[PDB]
Ligand binder design. Structure first.
Ligand SMILES: COC(=O)[C@@H]1C[C@@H](O)CN1C(=O)c1ccco1
Length: 185
């Protein structure tokens, strides 16, 4: 792809994080802690899952960023509406305001309803995410495999400002402690 020139500098919003997450000083990395991280509760925090939003809000234009997923067993990545539900149980779908892909149990899937199987020959260590607000497109790229396309959501109905979306996943296995990292431009 040739989307690299739309690169944006994403930082994580500490106030939206699940209370078990640990965000680095530079706000560019996030991992699952082994306990509650001693923060107060607020209406922004994702309560049920290890999720956090980017600070940046997008309502126009073309945006591109990259995320490092090295050695993780499970994660979700993409964008979501600013007004997504924070509390309780929900599914990641465009009807609920999410445009996402994930890794789970050794398979990659796009967060459609129902979910769509992805076809990845080279397990990615870094993911590229491209949003074209006006066109209604969210695309995912395999940086490890020379930028090959993973998935395109088209005909997106954003219906609001968008935020970068992250889920570091649970670590029930002891094999999913590694962080998500925003990669340098
Ligand atoms: C890009 O490849 C990966 O991230 C793979 C996917 C999954 O099989 C876990 N994994 C590891 O490499 C890993 C987990 C713990 C130590 O290494």
């Amino acid at each position: 792809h040739h989307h690299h020139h739309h690169m944006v500098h994403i930082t994580l919003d500490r106030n939206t994080a699940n209370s078990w997450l640990i965000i680095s000083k530079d706000r560019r990395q996030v991992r699952m802690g082994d306990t509650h991280q001693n923060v107060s509760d607020n209406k922004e925090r994702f309560s049920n899952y290890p999720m956090v939003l980017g600070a940046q809000r997008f309502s126009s234009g073309k945006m591109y960023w990259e995320v490092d997923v090295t050695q993780k067993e499970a994660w979700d990545l993409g964008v979501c509406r600013d007004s997504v539900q924070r509390k309780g149980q929900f599914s990641l779908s465009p009807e609920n305001g999410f445009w996402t892909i994930w890794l789970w149990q050794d398979s990659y899937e796009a967060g459609t309803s129902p979910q769509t199987t992805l076809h990845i020959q080279v397990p990615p260590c870094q993911i590229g995410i491209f949003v074209d607000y006006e066109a209604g497109v969210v695309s995912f790229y395999n940086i490890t495999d020379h930028g090959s396309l993973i998935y395109t959501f088209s005909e997106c109905v954003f219906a609001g400002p968008l935020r970068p979306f992250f889920n570091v996943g649970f670590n029930y296995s002891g094999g999913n402690a590694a962080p998500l990292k925003l990669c340098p431009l």
